[PDB]
Amino acid sequence: SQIRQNYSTEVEAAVNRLVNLYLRASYTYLSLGFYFDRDDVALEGVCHFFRELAEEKREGAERLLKMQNQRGGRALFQDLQKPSQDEWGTTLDAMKAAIVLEKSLNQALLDLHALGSAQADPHLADFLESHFLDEEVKLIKKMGDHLTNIQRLVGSQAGLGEYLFERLTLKH
Amino acid sequence: SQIRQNYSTEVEAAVNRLVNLYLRASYTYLSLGFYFDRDDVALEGVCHFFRELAEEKREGAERLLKMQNQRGGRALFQDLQKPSQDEWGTTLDAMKAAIVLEKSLNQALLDLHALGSAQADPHLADFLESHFLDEEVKLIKKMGDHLTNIQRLVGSQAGLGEYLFERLTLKH
Amino acid sequence: SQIRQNYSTEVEAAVNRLVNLYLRASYTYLSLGFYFDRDDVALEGVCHFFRELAEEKREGAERLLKMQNQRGGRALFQDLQKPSQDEWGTTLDAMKAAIVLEKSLNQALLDLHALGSAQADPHLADFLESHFLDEEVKLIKKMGDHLTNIQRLVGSQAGLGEYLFERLTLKH
Amino acid sequence: SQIRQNYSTEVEAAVNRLVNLYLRASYTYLSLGFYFDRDDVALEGVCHFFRELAEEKREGAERLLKMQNQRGGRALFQDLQKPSQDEWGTTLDAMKAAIVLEKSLNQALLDLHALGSAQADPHLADFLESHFLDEEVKLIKKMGDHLTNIQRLVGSQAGLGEYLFERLTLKH
Amino acid sequence: SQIRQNYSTEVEAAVNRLVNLYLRASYTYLSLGFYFDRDDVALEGVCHFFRELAEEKREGAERLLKMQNQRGGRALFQDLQKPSQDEWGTTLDAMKAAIVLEKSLNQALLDLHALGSAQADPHLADFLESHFLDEEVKLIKKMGDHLTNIQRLVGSQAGLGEYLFERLTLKH
């Protein structure tokens, strides 16, 4: 590289780690999506919701990789760990798992922002602020809204509630 | 005929039998459709679902008959047995009956494909692969998805669930 | 599942393995693409070529997963091994690696087709024939064409040849 | 002024200095552009590349001046030093000089951002982040990409390589 | 026939021979075209150039056959000899072979024109003048132009020259 300027080895490494976290999140959402497409689960609104998230997380990883090259850092890829479950339970279980996943991604963004700030790397800080921090806050708010609605629908007729949420809230 | 080539008498007969099975399936779906149009049943999404299937099965029979002539075989028609029931119960009962019917049609397709393969009749094999095997897999997946949704909706309020499935899943 | 018919546990497992191979290929192409976007490599036609392939391989994996559910099999995900190299050398080195990768995917498709045939699973066989086998042959032919052109351009002025191939053959 | 708020004399002075640096960069690019339009140089893609940069740097200076007035600071202009060379050598020499120039502008932006941060001037920090820091990173990446391509094309036929880069990479 | 007038048996036979020569030329160009589509040759501009010529020569044969019937002569077909080579070497070798082939076709046209003139058959003479003689002169000029350009590009970097001619002269 003959372009690198004000780009620490610490940030470079943390960016590579964050790419891995985003790709693993994308993989987790791929698994979630296809689980809800099983004939014995069959909630297509939920399938679509998670498949869209798999695409978003992949796009996030690609934006990070583009930035890594723009700064003169070098992409290094690691194994992608398989998702934490093979079967994901109810829509409620799945949405709970998704919120946990997003909170972990958000903390990783916040940690990287703090590192950039400590390293006086304003381009890195701006990059996260412009493309990641608000997208993450918006997504987590949506998931929280969903969780509340799913929970309200349980009552004593859980199957009915799960059907209605998929039909009337999720896009299909 | 002065066109027949590589077309066994065994395949010719099995094609005629398959036409009968498709026409009988069409007849079964005609009966299912009109049952759901009864004033004391009155589930128009279900009526439309089965009437559409009656049309599909008739079209399948006609494609087979066209192919029979293309190969130089001779169509032979047999009686069409009346459907197995006069009344079809709940949407759940009906969808269960439909899946049983489709699995039987699918096995007949698979048996004919195996016969064609044994007879080194690649045109027959390709014909089934191109126009029948995937259409059948897709349909059975849809029925399985429906069954799962219907079953989830039973709970302790079966009437409510039956109404909601017809309103919110089926086309009307 | 209440839809599974004529779908062996052997094929189900091999489909899961093939999904892993396609996702690993997609990952390899992601790494190839970003390597050619490095400021000290800077061959955008090559970047685009491999990024497009990453998308194609992901789409292939998703088609397999869709089919797995259509048949009533169950998706199981494994770790995605990181790509075999961190740096990919010249366009020639990269295209050689890509051909090796594609030949391995092609052999996996051929092995699965043979398994399906042995198991008298014509839907599986047709599925591969319709969506994978010719796409793979076409891609490998394109790569072979590229390799020949890259090799012709080496001469005694390798840098010049690498630039010209990227400018005049690859899309940019 | 009756509008000035949270705008230090230090930042005000540094903004004036940065305007001077941007105008001097614009002047340098004006000289570069016209050098490549000489009949004995005659590389119009290179002329256009540098003339466009002269416009960009002038626009940057004007944005800074607008901001200075928005904050209630007072523009102060100094002499514009003539560019460091009268003749700019090869496209390679020129692109090397341009990268050196851009790195100096980038460091000046980073220094000003640090000053704004130290002075708790978030409007100034945001201003640089929004209109300058990423534009600079993008430009330097482009120049690095160009340098790599120019360098690859030297080989033993430097004239040929210089022609081809101007024809096939630069806009004309 | 009840239409034949002023149409000698000599011309009729020579027309049949010329049809054979045109069809053999078409066959030769078919072989040339597919040779350049080999993965180890891979010059698609050259493939397209010769495939287009195969079409032109077939069209020429068909025009001759139409004329034969218009005059009341009788088409007689002979074997089409396979092309003179199975592999065609470089673009230069191929273009040299093509020029040799075209000169032979041109001499056959000239010989037939002379025969028509000797037989006081102005319709035949006009037919060749209107549809063949200038088309042939134009084609040979194009081939000569190509040969000169190919030859100029050999230098000490033959592979590079062959690539550049295919990219920058031939349609692709």
From Swiss-Prot, chains A, B, C, D, E:
Stores iron in a soluble, non-toxic, readily available form. Important for iron homeostasis. Iron is taken up in the ferrous form and deposited as ferric hydroxides after oxidation. Also plays a role in delivery of iron to cells. Mediates iron uptake in capsule cells of the developing kidney. Delivery to lysosomes by the cargo receptor NCOA4 for autophagic degradation and release or iron. It comes from Equus caballus (Horse). InterPro entries: Ferritin, Ferritin-like, Ferritin-like_diiron, Ferritin-like_SF, Ferritin_CS, Ferritin_DPS_dom. One of its GO terms (cellular component) is autolysosome. This is Ferritin light chain. Gene3D superfamilies: 1.20.1260.10. Residues 5-154 form the Ferritin-like diiron domain. The gene is FTL. Coiled coil: none annotated. The keyword Secreted does not apply.
